[PDB]
Structure 1
Amino acid sequence: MKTIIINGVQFNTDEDTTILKFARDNNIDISALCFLNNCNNDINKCEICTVEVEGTGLVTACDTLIEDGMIINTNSDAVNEKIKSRISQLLDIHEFKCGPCNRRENCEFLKLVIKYKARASKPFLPKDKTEYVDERSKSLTVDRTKCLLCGRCVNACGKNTETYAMKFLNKNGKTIIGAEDEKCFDDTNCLLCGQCIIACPVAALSEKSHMDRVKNALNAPEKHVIVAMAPSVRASIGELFNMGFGVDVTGKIYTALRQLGFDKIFDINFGADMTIMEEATELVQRIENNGPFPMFTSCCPGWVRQAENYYPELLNNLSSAKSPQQIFGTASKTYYPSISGLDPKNVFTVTVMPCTSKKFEADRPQMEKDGLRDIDAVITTRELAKMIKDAKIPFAKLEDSEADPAMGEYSGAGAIFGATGGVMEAALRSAKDFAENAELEDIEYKQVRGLNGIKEAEVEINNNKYNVAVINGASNLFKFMKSGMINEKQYHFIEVMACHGGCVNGGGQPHVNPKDLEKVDIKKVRASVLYNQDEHLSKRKSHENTALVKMYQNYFGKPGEGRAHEILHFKYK
C-alpha cells in the first residue's frame, strides 16, 4: 500500500493508476483537454493537466502513474501559470467569438478559459474564414478557426473505425487536421459516421447543416412539411435541455415539433417496422432458398460506405430493404398522398437523426422516384435542439402529445432499432413468426443485446439452427473479417452498426462532457429508454403495427413482392 499526499491530504491506496484518474476517483480537481478515449495527444501534448510532484517538477497528470512517497500539488502558482500559458497560446490560434458559435452552451475550451482567466497574447481575428472552412461534404464540415489541434478526432477515428480517415496534414508548412490529401471527406474511405465530431471539445467539426432546407420548406405556403424522428432522438435530446441522462422525452418532442410549424408529426420507428416487414421476409426467402448467406443489414449508411470502400464483394449480400429513413420517405411520397389528397410534389419530408451519415444517404442521387426525393432534409439531434431553442420553446415543461398515427404508430421491435442488436432482435421476432406460420410469445433475444464488440447467437427457426452475429462498431467489422471470425461457422444474418453502442451513440448526438462520460455509461443509459419503451408497448412485433398493416393491405400489398418490391428496396452496385 503506497502512501501519497495530494494538496496536503494523505491517501493510502493499492491502485496502479494515473494522477488524473486517482484525483477524479477522490474528487480532486485536475483539468484536462487532449486526453480522451484513454489516450492523450502523444505529439503536442496540451499540458493542461499539469500538476507538480515534489522532487520531480511539473508533470502531465493524465499519463503519470502514482508512486509511493509521491507528494502532489495540483493548484500551486507555478502549476496554474503554466496551464494559463498553454490556454493563452491556444487563444492565439482561436477565433474567440462565442455569441454565434454552435458550441456556445457546452464548450470545453470556454470552460477552461474562464476557469484560468486566460487571455490571448494577440486575439485571433481572421478576416475571411473561407480559407479555414471546409463545407464540401454532405455530412461533415470543418471550421479550423476553432481547431485546438488536440488530436482527439484523429484518435477517435482510429479507435472507433480503424480507417484513420481523419489525419494530421502538412498544409503550407503548418499542421491541420482533415481527410486524406485534404480532399472532401466524401471522396475518401471515410464513413461519414461523425465520431470525430463527438470527440471534439469545440466547434471545429460540425454536421453539414440542413436547417436552410427545413426553414425554406416551412416558409413555402404550398409545401406540406412532414417531420419524423429516429429512435434515438427521444432518448437523448433532453440532455441539451438540462434534463439529465436517460430521460424519455418522446411526448415533449411531438409537442415541440407542432409548435415549430410542421404539418404532420410522424415517426421513423414506423419506417423501422417497414424495414423489418421487408427484411424479415427476405431472410425467410433466403432460408427457403438455402442462401445466399450471410445476409447483412443495410440500414446503417456508415456500414454501407464501409462495405463500398473496403468489402465491395459483400454488397450483393446486403438486404435489399431500404433503411427506415429511406423506406419511410418512399412511402411519404406515394402512400401518404393516397390517404390525404396531397400532391406528391408538395410533400416535403424531414427526418431528425442521431447521425451525420444519414445526410449522405438522403442525398444519394438514386434515392428518389418520379423526380421526388425519398427524403428532402435530414437534421441532427443537435440541429433540432437549436431549432427549439431559437423558437424560445420551453422544452423541459411541454405537455405530452402524440404522433399522427397514419405513419407514426410503432411496435416495440421498431423502438429498439437505436441500440446495437436492436435490428437483429426486431427482425428475428417477425422472421420466426413468418417462417413457422405461428404467433410466438417468446420474443426477447437478450443474447444479441449489450455493448460487446461482437455478439453471436444460435437461433432455432422452423426446426433448423441458424447463426446470427451482431457487429457493434466499424472497428469491430474489421476485426470480424480480418480475424477469420466470419469463417468459424456459416453465418446467415448479420447486423452491422458503424457506431459503438448503435445509433444512440451516433455522430449527430449531443456532446457529453468527458467528466460525465467517466461517470455515466451513455451508450447503456440512452439505450435503456428504447428497451423500456419496448417493454411497455402494446405491440412488440413489427408486423403487428396496426397502421402499418393498414398501409400494406390498402396500398403496398404483401412484403417483398410487387409494389413493395418495386419501390421499397435498394441495391448497391
Structure 2
Amino acid sequence: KTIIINGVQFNTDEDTTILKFARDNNIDISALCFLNNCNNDINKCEICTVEVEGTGLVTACDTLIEDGMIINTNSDAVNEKIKSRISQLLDIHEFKCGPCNRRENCEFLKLVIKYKARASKPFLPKDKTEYVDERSKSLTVDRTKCLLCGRCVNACGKNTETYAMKFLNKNGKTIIGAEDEKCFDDTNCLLCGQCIIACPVAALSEKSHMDRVKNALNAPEKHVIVAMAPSVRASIGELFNMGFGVDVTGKIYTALRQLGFDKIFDINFGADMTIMEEATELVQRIENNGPFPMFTSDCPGWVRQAENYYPELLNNLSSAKSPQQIFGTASKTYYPSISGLDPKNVFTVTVMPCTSKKFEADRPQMEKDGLRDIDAVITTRELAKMIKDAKIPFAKLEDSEADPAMGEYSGAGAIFGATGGVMEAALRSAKDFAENAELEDIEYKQVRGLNGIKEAEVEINNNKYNVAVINGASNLFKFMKSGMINEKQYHFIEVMACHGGCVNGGGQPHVNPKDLEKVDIKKVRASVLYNQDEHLSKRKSHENTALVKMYQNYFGKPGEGRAHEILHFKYKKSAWSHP
C-alpha cells in the first residue's frame, strides 16, 4: 500500500490507523478522546481530524490507512474544524486555570493553546454545587471541567471490567457518573481511581484529605505522624520535572520534615509487619491443610471487588491488615508505649499512590478504643501540591533519613508497590518460617512482570505449592470466570486492582499520552523499588531490626495472641436473606 501524507509518499505494509501511522513517522496529529487504543465511539471529539482526498474530513484515530490515500493533516479546513471542536468544548468548560489542580499538566489547556481557540460564550456557572460530587470517600467529580470524552468510561471497562463509570442521562442532558447517579462508594465501583488517571482534565480527582492534614499540624496538641507508601518515592519526582524512574526517597523525608510533620516513618515498615502476619498465617494454613487458597488482603480495591462480586472469597482472605492499616494500629498502641505520647493526641497521616486507600482508612471498624488506625490519607499528587504550596525546592533538597522505630524497612517491604511484590515478599518469610532456616536464594522472578495472570510452583518445606499473581481487576474477573481457579489447587494468591501494582495507582501523577508510548511507566516506576531491594542489606521482613524489637517488646509472636488480636481484620459476607 502506498500512502501520501502532506505531500510525502510512503510505501508500507503496516495495517493500522492514520493516527498511529502518523506518529510513527513524526507527523503531528492532535488527539483528545483516543486513549488505551480506543476513542469515544458515540461522541467522537474529532480533534484527530485529517483530510483524505476523495473522501473528506475523517477521524485519524479510528480510520485505517489504505493504499491510494492522499492525506492532509494541516490544511485550513482541517485546523478550523479542530478549532471549532475545541471552541465548543470551551462552551461547556469553566476555563479558570488559576486555582485548578491540573493547571500544570492539563491536556485540554495544551490543545486550547495550540489552536488558539476561544469560546463562543464563556462557561461561568454561578453555583457549582450541582456540578460537583464530593460524596465519595475516594473520588470526586467536577462536571464544569468535563469534556464528555469518555476516557474514564473506557478506562474503567478496560482496567476493571466493572463499567462502574457510565454515561448517564441527567434531566435530559449527558454526564458521566456512577449507576443511577449514586455515590460511587455505594455502587460496585472499586474506588481504584483508574478513571482519574485517564482523565485529560480536572473533572475527576481524589477526595481531598489535605484540610485534615493541615488542621492537624496547626493543632498545638496533635502529634502528626507521616509515612509514605513504597510507590511514592518512585514517582513523586515526576511532578517536579525530575524525570521518570528517579529515587527521591531521601528528598521526601526532608520535604516532609520541612512541612512540619512531627514524626517521619514509612509504610514499608508496615509492609514488613503485614508479611510477618501473612507469612505466619500461610504457614499455619499449610500445616492445617487449608483453608486454600489464601488471598492477599492489602489492596482495598480488590477487597471491594471481593465484597461486591465474590463475597464467598472473603473468608479466604488473609486476616492481616494492609501495610497502611497495620502500621496505623501500631501508631496508636506501640508507638505511644515507646514515646510517652498520649494515644489520643497521635494523628497518623499516610501518603499513597491510591485513592482506594482513603476508603480503607475511613472504614468504621478500622479503629480501637475510639482511635482510628489512620486519620488521613493523601495521594502522591496531594503531597506534591502540598510541597509546592509550601514553595519547598524539592529537586534541590538534601537527603535525610526516616525515624528508625517505625521507619526502617527491608527489601521485601520495599517491592510491595509492584505487582507480585507482596507475593515475593511473603514467600521469602514463609519459606524461612516453615523450614526453620535462613535461606540464601530469595528472588522469585516468576511472579514479577506485567503479565495479567502469573503463576508459579513453589516448594516449601519439602512440599510443592501453587501460587498465582493476579495483575489488575479485569484479570481477577478473567481468572475467576474462565474457571482458572479450578484448573488446579492454588494455595496463595495475590490480587492488585491496578495493573502494574500500586505504582500505577489512581493517586499517582498523571502522565501525558505521548510520554506513555515513550516510557513504560509501570516498569520504570517499579524498577526503583526492585533496585532498593537489591541494595538493602536486609531483604526479609523478619530481619527488620526495628520491627523485630517491636514484636519482641510489645506484640509478641505474630499470628497469635495480642498480635492476632489487634493487627488483624476479617471481612464478613452478608448472611443469607430474602430479599
Give the TM bin, normalised by the shorter chain: over 0.9
Distance (Å, rounded) in 2 between the aligned partners of 1:17 and 1:243: 34
Structure 1 residue 12 displacement after superposition: 2.2
Q: CA deviation at 1:160?
A: 0.4
Q: Displacement, 1:70?
A: 1.7
Q: Per-residue deviation at 1:562?
A: 1.2
1:445-485 CA-to-partner distances (Å, cap 9, x unmatched) read 00000000000000000001100000000010000000000
Q: Give the deviation of 1:289 after TM superposition.
A: 0.4
Aligned residue pair count: 571
Task: Report which stretch shifted further, 364-373 or 5-14.
Answer: 5-14
1:12 and 1:107 mapped to 2: Cα distance?
36
What CA distance in whole angstroms lies between the structure 1 residues aligned with 2:5 and 2:538? 56
Query: How many Å separate the matches in 1 of 2:340 and 2:12?
Result: 72
**SS at 2:119 equivalent:** coil
Report percent identity of matched pairs.
100
Give the Å deviation of 1:5.
Answer: 1.6
Measure how far apart 1:53 and its partner are: 1.1
Q: Deviation of residue 490 (structure 1)?
A: 0.5
Secondary structure of the 1:496 match is strand
Once the two structures are superposed, residues 25-74 of structure 1 have per-residue CA deviations (whole angstroms, 9 ceiling, x without a partner) of 11111000000010000001000000111111111010111121222111
> In the aligned structure 2, how far is the partner of 1:446 from the partner of 1:131?
50
CA distance in 2, matches of 1:393, 1:75: 43
Residue 182 of structure 1 and its aligned partner are, at CA, apart by 0.3
| Secondary structure in 2 matching 1:231 | coil
Distance across 2 between alignment mates of 1:513 and 1:347: 39
2:519 is paired with a residue of what secondary structure?
A: coil
Deviation at 1:3, TM superposition (A): 2.2
Deviation, 1:173, is 0.4
Displacement of 1:285:
0.2
Distance 1:25 1:331 in 2: 53
CA displacement at 1:4 relative to structure 2 = 1.5
Q: Does 1:61 align with 2:60?
A: yes
- Secondary structure at the counterpart of residue 186 of structure 1: helix
Q: Which runs of 4+ in 1 moved over 3 A?
A: none
Counterpart-to-counterpart distance in 1, 2:156 and 2:269: 32
3-state SS of paired residue (1:471): strand
C-alpha distance in 2, partners of 1:389/1:9? Answer: 46
Task: Return the offset for 1:241.
Answer: 0.4
> Which whole-Å CA distance do the structure 1 matches of 2:104 and 2:458 have between them?
47
Please report how far the alpha carbon of residue 11 of structure 1 lies from its aligned counterpart in structure 2 after TM superposition: 2.0
Bigger drift between 298-307 and 514-523 goes to: 514-523
Cα displacement (A) at 1:6: 1.4
Which structure 2 segments of 5+ residues have no match? 572-579
- Structure 1, unmatched stretches of 5+, are none
> Aligned residue for 1:250?
249
TM-fit CA distance, 1:8:
1.7
Q: CA deviation at 1:426?
A: 0.2
- Give the superposition deviation at 1:248: 0.6
Q: Point out the more displaced range, 147-156 or 69-78.
A: 69-78
Give the Cα–Cα distance (whole angstroms) in 2 for the partners of residues 14 and 225 of structure 1.
61
SS at match of 2:202: coil
SS in 1 for 2:65: coil
The RMSD of aligned alpha carbons is 0.6
| SS of residue in 1 equivalent to 2:144 | helix
Cα distance in 2 between the residues matched to 1:14 and 1:253: 49
Q: Distance in 2 between matches of 1:278 and 1:216?
A: 34
CA distance in structure 2 between the partners assigned to 1:53 and 1:314 by the alignment:
54
Tell me by how many angstroms 1:338 deviates. Answer: 0.8
Cα distance in structure 2, aligned partners of 1:530 and 1:5: 46
Deviation at 1:206, TM superposition (A): 0.4
How far apart in 2 are the matches of 1:75 and 1:387? 41
What per-residue deviation string (whole Å, max 9, x for no partner) do you get for residues 115-164 of structure 1?
00001001001000001000000000000000000000000001100101
Q: What's the counterpart of residue 491 of structure 1? A: 490
Residue 403 of structure 1: aligned partner: 402
Query: How far apart in 2 are the matches of 1:29 and 1:356?
Result: 34
- Distance across 1 between alignment mates of 2:404 and 2:8: 61
Instruction: Confirm or deny that 1:559 pairs with 2:558.
Output: yes
Tell me the alpha carbon deviations over residues 218-241 of structure 1, each in whole angstroms, 9 at most, x when there is no partner.
000110100000000001101100
Map 1:77-156 → 2, pairs under 5 A = 77-156=76-155
Superposed displacement of residue 17, structure 1: 1.1
CA distance in 2, matches of 1:433, 1:203: 48
> Which deviates more from structure 2 when the two are superposed, residues 386-395 or residues 4-13?
4-13
Cα distance in 1 between the residues matched to 2:543 and 2:325:
21
Residue aligning to 1:10: 9
SS at match of 1:146: coil
1:499-537, Cα deviation, whole Å (9 max, x unpaired): 000000000000011111111111110011100110000
Q: TM (normalized to structure 2)?
A: 0.98
The C-alpha deviation readout for 1:204-229, integer Å capped at 9, x for no partner, is 00000000100000000110100000
1:164 matched residue in structure 2: 163
> Which aligned pairs between 1:229-378 and structure 2 lie closer than 5 A?
229-378=228-377
Residue 70 (str. 1) matches residue 33 (str. 2): no
Task: Give the Å deviation of 1:10.
Answer: 2.1
Name the SS of the counterpart of 1:490 in structure 2. Answer: coil
TM-score, normalization: structure 1? 0.99
CA deviations on 1:317-359 (whole Å, 9 max, x unpaired) are 0000000000000000011011111010001000000000000
Structure 2 partner of 1:22: 21
What is the rounded CA distance, in whole Å, between the counterparts of 1:74 and 1:518 in structure 2?
Answer: 21
Could you tell me how far apart the structure 2 residues matched to 1:281 and 1:390 are? Answer: 44
Q: SS of the residue aligned with 2:101?
A: coil
Report the Cα distance in structure 1 between the residues aligned to 2:478 and 2:19, rounded to whole angstroms.
Answer: 31
SS of the residue corresponding to residue 122 of structure 2 reads coil
Q: Please give the alpha-carbon distance, in whole angstroms, between the structure 2 residues aligned to 1:61 and 1:438.
A: 61
How far did 1:7 drift? 1.4
Deviation by residue 1:388-419 (Cα, 9 ceiling, x = unmatched)? 00000111111111111110000000000000
CA distance in 1, matches of 2:243, 2:14: 31
